[PDB]
Design a protein around this ligand. Structure first.
Ligand SMILES: CCCCCCCCCCCCCCCCCC(=O)O[C@H](COC(=O)CCCCCCCCCCCCCCC)COP(=O)(O)OCC[N+](C)(C)C
Ligand SMILES: *[C@@H]1O[C@H](CO)[C@@H](O)[C@H](O)[C@H]1NC(C)=O
Ligand SMILES: *[C@@H]1O[C@H](CO)[C@@H](O)[C@H](O)[C@H]1NC(C)=O
Ligand SMILES: CCCCCCCCCCCC
Ligand code: NA
Lengths: 99, 271
């Protein structure tokens, strides 16, 4: 007798230039339970040394975390956020858009 | 409006594995953290001490440590009977908003279980059998606890929160001007492009990113969630779909900008 919510992945940059150092943010919202696996990707490879939030939950008790790594973007580079959770049948890759 | 509170997460995986984790919050602003393993308060900011003596805070840190461990200890002791009810998660939200009002909300599997009203532990109207059982033991069996919880939310929390606000005076009332830009993105439609208007790295959270088709403000854009940045600032993006070259702009209104609002023009205008 409880709740199961699927994570809401949201990907963005701390600032808008190639070669100029930035921060990639992956914000995972409203999920049940807390057991979550959030990964950050550089051309599909799991980015190591990536800091994150202390787990917190919204008014409605759904959890949330902000994931971040100091990154330097380039033309040929593809950045995305891979999240896997009990509600998810297979991981969810969410691409960071640019242009 | 002034609300300080602690949050606790008690994750109960199996007969043996069960962990606990806390945080110290001043609304959206995190002020404290909890070393789950060691049982040590983490003061995130310079002013996280507030006005409280370290002899105080240590005794507080201590009481928290005992409780963070004991709650798990006592929970796994009851769960030692029905190894089927595994896994499950307990959630705690408790503090005060300053006459001043205190609180203690509890959730099970992300659904209100019980509350602390005056000195009575009151079941959330719904799952009776588990709540009524817990509430009973809290109201009539664990003797110290109720008075302590009462004291923490009504005597300590208001005393602390007042201190913390006078402590973080500059940081809590700081004004961070937004970094705003435009962006193009292929829409799903033939001869249709998306117009992303960004406003990043701003604080306090209340912001107003609006797309204008020349004169009028256009509702019918894709407003995002005001999202967090590691630094403490906020981020917002509003998407406007346009057909193959449609003279429009983006007005950004933030508390920080001195009565002025940022305007961002996409391409050419034709008056
Ligand atoms: C199946 C059917 C059965 C189902 C039944 C399930 C049974 C489970 C019930 C388990 C409940 C057990 C409760 C035990 C809780 C416990 O051990 O902790 C108790 C009480 O501890 C707590 O609950 C306190 C923690 C929560 C309070 C959080 C609010 C704090 C906000 C105030 C701001 C302070 C600033 C903090 C600095 C960062 C120990 O009390 P004590 O002896 O330490 O009190 C005397 C000491 N002084 C002098 C300080 C007053
Ligand atoms: C309990 O769950 C943990 C995962 O959190 C697992 O590593 C461990 O093997 C489990 N133990 C038992 C006895 O089920
Ligand atoms: C709160 O409960 C106490 C008994 O513990 C009682 O004396 C007091 O009058 C009650 N007040 C309210 C507002 O219910
Ligand atoms: C095993 C059922 C979950 C028990 C949840 C206990 C929550 C009560 C919090 C108040 C203790 C001070
Ligand atoms: Na009591």
């Amino acid at each position: 007798t409880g709740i199961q919510r699927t994570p809401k992945i949201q990907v963005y940059s701390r600032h808008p230039e190639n070669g100029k150092s930035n921060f990639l943010n992956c914000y995972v919202s409203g999920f049940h339970p807390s057991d979550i696996e959030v990964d950050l990707l550089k051309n599909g490879e799991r980015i190591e040394k990536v800091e994150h939030s202390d787990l917190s939950f919204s008014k409605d008790w759904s959890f949330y975390l902000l994931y971040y790594t100091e990154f330097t973007p380039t033309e040929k580079d593809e950045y995305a956020c891979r999240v896997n959770h009990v509600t998810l049948s297979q991981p969810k890759i969410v691409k960071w858009d640019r242009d | 409006h002034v609300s300080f509170h602690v949050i606790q997460i008690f994750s109960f995986v199996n007969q043996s594995w069960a962990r606990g984790q806390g945080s110290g919050w001043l609304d959206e602003l995190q002020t404290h953290g909890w070393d789950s393993e060691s049982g040590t308060i983490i003061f995130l900011h310079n002013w996280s001490k507030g006005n409280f003596s370290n002899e105080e805070l240590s005794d507080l840190e201590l009481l928290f440590r005992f409780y963070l461990f004991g709650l798990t200890r006592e929970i796994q002791d009851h769960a030692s009977q029905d190894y089927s009810k595994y896994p499950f998660e307990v959630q705690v939200k408790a503090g005060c908003e300053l006459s001043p009002e205190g609180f203690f909300q509890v959730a099970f599997n992300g659904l209100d279980l019980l509350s602390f009203q005056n000195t009575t532990w009151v079941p959330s109207p719904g799952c009776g059998s588990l709540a009524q059982s817990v509430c009973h033991l809290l109201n009539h069996q664990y003797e110290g606890v109720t008075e302590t919880v009462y004291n923490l939310i009504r005597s300590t929390c208001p005393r602390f929160l007042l201190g913390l606000l006078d402590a973080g005076k500059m940081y809590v009332h700081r004004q961070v001007r937004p970094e705003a830009w435009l962006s193009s993105r292929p829409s799903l439609g033939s001869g249709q492009l998306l117009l992303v208007c960004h406003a990043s790295g701003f604080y306090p959270k209340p912001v107003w990113v609006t797309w204008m088709r020349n004169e009028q403000e256009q509702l019918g854009t894709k407003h995002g969630d005001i999202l967090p940045n590691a630094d403490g600032t906020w981020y917002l993006q509003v998407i406007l779909e346009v057909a193959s070259e449609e003279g429009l702009s983006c007005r950004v209104r933030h508390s920080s900008l001195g009565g002025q609002d940022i305007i961002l023009y996409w391409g050419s205008l034709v008056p």
